[PDB]
CSV table of C-alpha atoms in Angstrom, one decimal:
chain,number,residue,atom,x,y,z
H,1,UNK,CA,3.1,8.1,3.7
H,2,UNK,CA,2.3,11.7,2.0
H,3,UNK,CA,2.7,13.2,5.2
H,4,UNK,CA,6.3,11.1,6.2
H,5,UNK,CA,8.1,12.5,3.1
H,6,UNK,CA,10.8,14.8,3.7
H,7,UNK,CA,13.8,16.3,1.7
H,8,UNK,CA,17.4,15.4,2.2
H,9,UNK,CA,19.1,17.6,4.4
H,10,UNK,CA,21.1,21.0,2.9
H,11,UNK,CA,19.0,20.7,-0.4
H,12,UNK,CA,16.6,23.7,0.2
H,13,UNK,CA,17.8,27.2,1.8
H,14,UNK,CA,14.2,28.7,2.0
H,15,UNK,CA,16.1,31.8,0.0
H,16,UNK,CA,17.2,35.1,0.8
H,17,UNK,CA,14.2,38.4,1.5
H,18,UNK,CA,15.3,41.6,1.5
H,19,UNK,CA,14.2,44.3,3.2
H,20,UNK,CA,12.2,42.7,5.9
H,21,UNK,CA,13.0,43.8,9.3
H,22,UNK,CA,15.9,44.5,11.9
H,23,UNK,CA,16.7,40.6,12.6
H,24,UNK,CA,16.3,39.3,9.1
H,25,UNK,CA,20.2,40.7,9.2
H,26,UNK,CA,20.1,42.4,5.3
H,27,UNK,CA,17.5,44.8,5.4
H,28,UNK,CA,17.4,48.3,4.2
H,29,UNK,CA,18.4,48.1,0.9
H,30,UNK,CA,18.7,44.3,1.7
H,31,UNK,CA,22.6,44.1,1.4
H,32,UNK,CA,23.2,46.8,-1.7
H,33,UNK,CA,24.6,49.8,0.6
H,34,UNK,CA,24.0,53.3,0.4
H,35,UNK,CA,23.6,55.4,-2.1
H,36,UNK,CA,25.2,54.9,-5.5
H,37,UNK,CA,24.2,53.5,-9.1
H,38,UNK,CA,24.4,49.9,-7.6
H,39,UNK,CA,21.7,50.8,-4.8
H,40,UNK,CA,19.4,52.1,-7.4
H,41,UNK,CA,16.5,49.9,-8.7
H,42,UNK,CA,18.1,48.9,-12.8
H,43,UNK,CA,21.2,50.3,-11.4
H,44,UNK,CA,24.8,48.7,-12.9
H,45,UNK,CA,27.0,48.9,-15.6
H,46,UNK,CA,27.0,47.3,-18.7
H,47,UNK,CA,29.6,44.3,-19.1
H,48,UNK,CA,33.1,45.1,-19.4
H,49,UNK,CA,32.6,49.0,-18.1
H,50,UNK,CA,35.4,50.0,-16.3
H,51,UNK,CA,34.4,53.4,-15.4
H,52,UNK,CA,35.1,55.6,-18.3
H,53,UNK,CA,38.1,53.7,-18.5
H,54,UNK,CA,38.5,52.2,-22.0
H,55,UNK,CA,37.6,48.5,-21.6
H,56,UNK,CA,40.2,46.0,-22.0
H,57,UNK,CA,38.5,44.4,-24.3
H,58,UNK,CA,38.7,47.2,-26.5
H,59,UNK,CA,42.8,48.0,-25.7
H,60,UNK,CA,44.1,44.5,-26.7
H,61,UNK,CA,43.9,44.2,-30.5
H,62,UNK,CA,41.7,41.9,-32.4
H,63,UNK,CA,43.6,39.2,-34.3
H,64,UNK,CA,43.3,36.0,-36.6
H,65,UNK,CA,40.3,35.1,-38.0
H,66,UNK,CA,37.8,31.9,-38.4
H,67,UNK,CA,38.5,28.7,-40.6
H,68,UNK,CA,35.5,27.5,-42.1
H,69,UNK,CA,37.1,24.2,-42.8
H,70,UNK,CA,37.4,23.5,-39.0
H,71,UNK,CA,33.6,23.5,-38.2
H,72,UNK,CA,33.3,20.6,-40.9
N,1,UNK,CA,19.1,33.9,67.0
N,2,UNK,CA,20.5,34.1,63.6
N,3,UNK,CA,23.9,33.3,61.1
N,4,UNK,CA,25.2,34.6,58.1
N,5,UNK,CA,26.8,32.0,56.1
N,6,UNK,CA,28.6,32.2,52.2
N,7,UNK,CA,26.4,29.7,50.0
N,8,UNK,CA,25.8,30.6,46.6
N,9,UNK,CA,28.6,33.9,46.7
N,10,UNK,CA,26.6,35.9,48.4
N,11,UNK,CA,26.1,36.2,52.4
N,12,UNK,CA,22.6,35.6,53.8
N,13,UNK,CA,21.4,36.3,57.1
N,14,UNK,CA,18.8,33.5,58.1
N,15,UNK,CA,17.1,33.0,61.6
N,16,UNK,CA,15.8,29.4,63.0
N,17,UNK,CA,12.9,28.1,61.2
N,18,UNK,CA,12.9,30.9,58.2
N,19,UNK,CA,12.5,30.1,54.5
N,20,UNK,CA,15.6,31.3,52.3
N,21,UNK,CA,15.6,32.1,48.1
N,22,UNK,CA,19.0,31.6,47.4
N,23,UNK,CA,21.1,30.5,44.4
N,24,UNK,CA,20.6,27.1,42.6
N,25,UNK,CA,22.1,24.1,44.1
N,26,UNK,CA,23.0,20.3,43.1
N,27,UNK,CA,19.8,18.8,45.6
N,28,UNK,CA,17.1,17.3,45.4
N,29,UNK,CA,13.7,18.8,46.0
N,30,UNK,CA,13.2,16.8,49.4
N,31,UNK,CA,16.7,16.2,50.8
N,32,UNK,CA,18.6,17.7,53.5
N,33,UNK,CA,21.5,20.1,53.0
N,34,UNK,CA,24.8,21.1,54.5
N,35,UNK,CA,25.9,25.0,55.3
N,36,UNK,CA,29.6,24.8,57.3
N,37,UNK,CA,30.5,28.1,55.6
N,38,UNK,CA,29.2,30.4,58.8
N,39,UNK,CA,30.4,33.8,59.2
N,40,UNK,CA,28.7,34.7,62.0
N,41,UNK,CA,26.7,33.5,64.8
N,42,UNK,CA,24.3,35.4,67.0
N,43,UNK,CA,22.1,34.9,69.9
N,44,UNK,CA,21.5,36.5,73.6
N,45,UNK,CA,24.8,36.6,73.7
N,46,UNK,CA,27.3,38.0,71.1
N,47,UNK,CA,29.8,35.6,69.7
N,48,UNK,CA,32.2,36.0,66.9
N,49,UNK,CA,34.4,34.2,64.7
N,50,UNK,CA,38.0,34.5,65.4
N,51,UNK,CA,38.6,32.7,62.3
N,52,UNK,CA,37.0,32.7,59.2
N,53,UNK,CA,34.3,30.3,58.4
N,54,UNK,CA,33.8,29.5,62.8
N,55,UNK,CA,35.4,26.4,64.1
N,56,UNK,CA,32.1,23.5,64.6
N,57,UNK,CA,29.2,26.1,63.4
N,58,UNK,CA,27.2,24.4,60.9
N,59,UNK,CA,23.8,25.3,59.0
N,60,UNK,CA,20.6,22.3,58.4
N,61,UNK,CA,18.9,23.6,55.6
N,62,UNK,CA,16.0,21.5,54.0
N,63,UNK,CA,15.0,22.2,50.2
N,64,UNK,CA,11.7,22.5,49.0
N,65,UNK,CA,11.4,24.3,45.9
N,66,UNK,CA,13.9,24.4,42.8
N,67,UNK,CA,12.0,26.7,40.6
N,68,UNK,CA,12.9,29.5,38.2
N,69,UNK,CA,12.4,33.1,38.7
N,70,UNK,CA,10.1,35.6,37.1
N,71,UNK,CA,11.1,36.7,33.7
N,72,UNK,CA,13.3,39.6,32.8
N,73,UNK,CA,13.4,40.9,29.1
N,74,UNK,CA,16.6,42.4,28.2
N,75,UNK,CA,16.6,45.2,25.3
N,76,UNK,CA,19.3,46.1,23.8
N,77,UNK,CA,19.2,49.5,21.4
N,78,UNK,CA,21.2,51.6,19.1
N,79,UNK,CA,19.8,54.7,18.5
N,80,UNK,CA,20.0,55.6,14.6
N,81,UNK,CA,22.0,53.0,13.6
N,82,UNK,CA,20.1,49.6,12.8
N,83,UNK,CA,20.5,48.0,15.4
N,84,UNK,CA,18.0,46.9,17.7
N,85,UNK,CA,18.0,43.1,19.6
N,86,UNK,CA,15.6,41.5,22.6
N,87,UNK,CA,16.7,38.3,24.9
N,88,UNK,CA,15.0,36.9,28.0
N,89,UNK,CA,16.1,35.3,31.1
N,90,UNK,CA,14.6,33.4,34.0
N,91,UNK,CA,17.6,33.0,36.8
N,92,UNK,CA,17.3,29.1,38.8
N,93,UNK,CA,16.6,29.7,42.5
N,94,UNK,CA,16.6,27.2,45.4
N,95,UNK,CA,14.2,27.7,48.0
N,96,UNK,CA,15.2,25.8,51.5
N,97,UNK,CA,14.2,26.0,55.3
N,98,UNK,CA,16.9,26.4,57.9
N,99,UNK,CA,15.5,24.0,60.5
N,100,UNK,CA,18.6,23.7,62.7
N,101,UNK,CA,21.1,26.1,63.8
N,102,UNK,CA,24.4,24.6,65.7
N,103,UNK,CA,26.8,26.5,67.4
């Protein structure tokens, strides 16, 4: 019965390829637009960048501290 | 010694005994078929319809083929912008005999 064993239905999607032909739907540039930083190959930005902006992570102030006594 | 009769929403013009390609039709391959949409009816003499569709004119038509026609690719194209898609199509046709034409 090698040869009657199949998966259950929806559990594979086969995956997604970029870049290979007109049909495949995301091709050139396989769904990354034009130019940019994002279409570039080790294109992004770092977490929290919000364009030269200064992060919010960095306007809200830092405050309290950790109890050691609460780990234990 | 010919009619023109609405079948498939197009006229034909069909003589006695002649083999006509028209559109596809609810009939079997091998059964008998029935035409009282005549336009027009001519022969030695000229006679015309004073009304649409005659009065008692009436077409016996005899199918013999219910095949598909020969294939036509469709291309679809957009020039520089990505686009580019192919389809086919193979229209139904139904072949039949006129073997009787009334008056």
């Amino acid at each position: 019965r090698l040869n009657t064993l199949s998966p259950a239905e929806g559990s594979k999607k086969a995956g997604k390829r970029l870049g290979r032909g007109i049909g495949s739907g995301l091709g050139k540039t396989g769904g990354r637009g034009h130019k940019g930083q994002k279409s570039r190959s080790g294109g992004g930005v770092r977490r929290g960048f919000e364009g030269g902006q200064m992060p919010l992570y960095r306007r809200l102030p830092k405050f309290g501290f950790t109890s050691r006594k609460a780990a234990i | 010694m010919y009619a023109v009769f609405q079948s498939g929403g197009k006229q034909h013009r069909v003589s006695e005994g002649q083999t006509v390609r028209l559109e596809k039709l609810d009939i079997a391959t091998g059964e008998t078929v029935e035409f009282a949409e005549v336009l027009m009816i001519a022969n030695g003499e000229e006679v015309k319809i004073g009304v649409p569709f005659v009065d008692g004119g009436v077409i016996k038509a005899e199918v013999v083929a219910h095949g598909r026609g020969e294939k036509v690719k469709i291309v679809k194209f957009r020039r520089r912008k990505h686009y580019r898609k192919q389809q086919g199509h193979r229209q139904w046709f139904t072949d039949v005999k006129i073997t009787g034409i009334s008056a």
